[PDB]
């Protein structure tokens, strides 16, 4: 046991298990050239660099899986929510940390992954005749995430059977629980909007269904804690 403390926050997470650094790159600030050359972007090191602990989601024998959209997820709660709202341009890396409190008498496996530009696609009506672009609920599901309706096709006709081709980490209950992923800023632009375009999505699906002999707490809590690595903003409003 060893509790990391970076900010007015103090998560009592494991000493130092294995963390998958995304696409093999630590999120950093910027050389000296961007979508702003006579506009030196202030780099929030203040309260924009602490631990955020999203409202734990409950895993049932039936959860289809969940997903969050960055940077949206936090533009809500937080002083990082203060920045993302009062600023025009934005660039920031991350570091998610998904924990699972369960007993040795439970069992399951969660695939946790980061998928850049995660574009959803609802039923398209019901059978497939309605160009209805998903609600403002599926495009930016705040800090409480959103559930997958068709886990198999990740809600975008792509097979989850191949999701591991993204920065991912497994969470097999009989072997661990906490899993970590350091995401670097991935975009086709140095500085992009932090309110309309969501640089990516964090998925967390039960590949091996949760289960327990009858009599154990049936819902295992999944606690997602994240830390904004190298925030950057330009021009306030």
């Amino acid at each position: 046991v060893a509790q990391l403390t970076i900010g007015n926050s103090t998560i009592t997470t494991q000493e130092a298990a294995n963390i998958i650094v995304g696409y093999g790159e630590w999120p950093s600030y910027c050389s000296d050239s961007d979508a702003t050359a006579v506009d030196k972007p202030t780099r929030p090191d203040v309260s924009v660099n602490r631990f955020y602990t999203l409202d734990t989601k409950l895993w049932e024998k039936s959860s289809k899986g969940w997903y969050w959209k960055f940077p949206d997820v936090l533009t809500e709660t937080g002083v990082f929510g203060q920045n993302a709202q009062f600023h025009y341009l934005y660039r920031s890396g991350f570091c998610i940390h998904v924990q699972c409190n369960a007993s040795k008498f439970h069992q399951g496996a969660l695939l946790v992954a980061i998928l850049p530009e995660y574009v959803i696609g609802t039923v398209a009506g019901g059978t497939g005749t309605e160009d209805s672009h998903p609600p403002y609920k599926q495009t930016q599901p705040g800090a409480d995430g959103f559930e997958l309706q068709h886990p198999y096709v990740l809600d975008a006709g792509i097979p989850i059977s191949q999701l591991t081709v993204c920065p991912h980490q497994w969470i097999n209950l009989r072997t661990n629980n906490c899993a970590t992923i350091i995401v670097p800023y991935i975009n086709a632009l140095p500085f992009d909007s932090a309110l309309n375009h969501c640089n990516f999505g964090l998925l967390v699906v039960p590949i091996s269904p949760l289960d327990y002999d009858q009599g154990a707490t049936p819902v295992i809590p999944i606690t997602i804690t994240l830390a904004p690595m190298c925030s950057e903003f330009a021009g306030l409003r």
């Binding site: 850049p116 574009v119 609802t122 209805s132 672009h133 006709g157 909007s193 309309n196 969501c198």
Partner: protein, 218 residues
């Protein structure tokens, strides 16, 4: 065994047919001996699935124009293919001062002459094109649609003041070159619904691939 056939340029090369304009002498479609084709690399069926293997791409393209009659015949008709750089307005009439504006590269060639070919550079004002855009470009549903990814517009037409003498069919081939891809993503496994978004049949979800009887019986 040389791992060269597995590169990116060797995967995405090869001139594919992406467009087929049609200038019937008389009929419905393109009743003015001219038509506007928006560069769309999905003009090639299986291309979508492929490029969509990545999230960010960068490339140039060599377009080739094979024009003839519906029969496949060669004829002494002179054509003019014009390029509308994403940002400039397109022709709307058979002599909109659009075909006149120099900043719109045109290329005259007769059907006698071998196919006409030209190279379009990586347009986009972004670092790269991006097949996915998880947001809205800061009434209507503007989701998933990425602005700057527009490669331009080719406007085919029979040179001259009057209509053409024979019916024509211009086939447009495009081979992309010097490719760079990024962020590999899962391979589409549900039929495509619209050229727009990634929507799929919300009930007609089939398994990624064929299925069998029992897991023990091979």
């Amino acid at each position: 065994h040389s791992t060269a056939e597995t590169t990116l340029d060797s995967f995405f090369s090869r001139a594919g047919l992406v467009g087929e304009i049609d200038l019937p002498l008389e009929g419905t479609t393109n009743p003015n001996g001219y038509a506007n084709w928006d560069i769309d690399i999905t003009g090639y069926a299986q291309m979508r699935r492929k490029v969509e293997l990545f999230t960010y791409m960068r490339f140039d393209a060599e377009f080739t124009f094979v024009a003839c009659t519906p029969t496949g015949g060669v004829v002494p008709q002179l054509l003019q293919y014009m390029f509308v750089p994403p940002g400039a307005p397109k022709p709307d009439s058979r002599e909109s001062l659009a075909w006149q504006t120099a900043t719109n590269p045109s290329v005259f060639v007769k059907l006698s002459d071998p196919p006409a070919q030209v190279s379009v550079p990586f347009m986009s004002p972004a670092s790269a094109y991006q097949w996915f855009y998880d947001g809205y470009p800061t009434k209507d549903l503007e989701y998933g649609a990425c602005p700057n990814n527009m490669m331009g517009t080719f406007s085919v037409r029979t040179v001259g003041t009057s209509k053409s003498k024979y019916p024509l069919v211009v086939r447009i081939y495009m081979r992309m070159k010097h490719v760079r891809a990024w962020i590999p993503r899962p391979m589409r496994n549900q039929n495509y619904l619209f050229k727009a978004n990634p929507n799929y049949a919300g009930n007609s979800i089939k398994p990624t691939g064929a299925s069998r009887t029992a897991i023990t019986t091979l």
